[PDB]
């Protein structure tokens, strides 16, 4: 169950496998090119490959080979029986490390579900000049928001996410939320109406 990712594309899977993955990392996800089939996305030698999984309704297979009633039995099988999964050339593909579904970051300044009014609240009565956090967007599902204290109020800056690639309405697009926060720690961003939005200290979640 853990290595299944319900709502990601092949490009977010590759970028996942290259950022949080290693060689031998893999994940399952639905098929975007063809619902509702599935896809094994796997990392080997620093590159990412995808494998079609057929769902007839009675079984799951890799369009050949063994037939399994469920998706987990198929993945489990191909994890345990290394060698059974061969490309035509001769190279075998290894399912070694599942890549478990998780948050966009593990960093403490990521509060997750947290609205602008309650984030504004914490940043008032616990944030000082430069305290910031990143939080999910509630007006644009799938996207994020950097809330900052520029003392004597709080600013919100929509962080867009397109295929696991993050920017603040343009400029550079970082591979994770961490690269964005660190880059803009070194490099304060300037709001249209003049306020410069320095990031001094993260307001970590308790």
């Amino acid at each position: 169950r853990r290595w299944f990712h319900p709502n990601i594309t092949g490009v977010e899977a590759e970028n996942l496998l290259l950022t949080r993955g290693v060689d031998g990392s893999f994940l399952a996800r639905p098929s975007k090119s063809n619902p509702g089939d599935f896809t094994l996305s796997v990392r080997r030698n620093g590159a990412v490959t995808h494998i079609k999984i057929q769902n007839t309704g009675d079984y799951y297979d890799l369009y050949g080979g063994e037939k399994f009633a469920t998706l987990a039995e198929l993945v489990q099988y191909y994890m345990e029986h290394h060698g059974q999964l061969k490309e035509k050339n001769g190279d075998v593909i290894e399912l070694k490390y599942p890549l478990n579904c998780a948050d966009p970051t593990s960093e403490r300044w990521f509060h997750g579900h947290l609205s602008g009014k309650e984030a504004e609240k914490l940043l008032t009565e616990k944030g000082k000049h430069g305290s910031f956090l990143v939080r999910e967007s509630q007006s644009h599902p799938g996207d994020f928001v950097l809330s900052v204290r520029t003392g004597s109020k709080v600013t919100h800056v929509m962080i867009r996410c397109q295929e696991l690639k993050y920017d603040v309405g343009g400029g550079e697009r970082f591979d994770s939320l961490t690269d964005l926060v660190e880059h803009y720690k070194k490099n304060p961003m300037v709001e249209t109406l003049g306020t410069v939005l320095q990031l001094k200290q993260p307001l970590n979640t308790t």
Binding site: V48, T49, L62, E87
Partner: peptide
């Protein structure tokens, strides 16, 4: 994204 064909032939 590159898609690998699995050989059972």
């Amino acid at each position: 994204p590159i898609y690998a064909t699995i050989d059972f032939d």
